[PDB]
């Protein structure tokens, strides 16, 4: 008895302009997520697939 199934859509409304925007290069192709979660999330799927590995330093990861 009671099981609901909580639910979200990930939405920052405008991008934060007095914040450092986390960006991934990768393939010399430069993402910029200003959430980090998805900045992450695109670095180890990435990295998973090529068998490498990544890091966030100042919000800049290189998926190796």
């Known amino acids: 008895m009671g099981s609901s199934h909580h639910h979200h859509h990930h939405s920052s409304g405008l991008v934060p302009r007095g914040s450092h925007m986390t960006q991934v290069h990768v393939d010399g192709v430069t993402y910029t997520f200003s959430n980090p979660e998805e900045a ?11 068998g490498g590995t990544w890091e966030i330093k100042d919000g800049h990861i290189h998926v190796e």
Do not use: G, L, N
Request: aromatic share 10%; glycine share 0%.
């Open 40 to 50: 992450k999330k695109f670095a180890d799927e990435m990295a998973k697939r090529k």
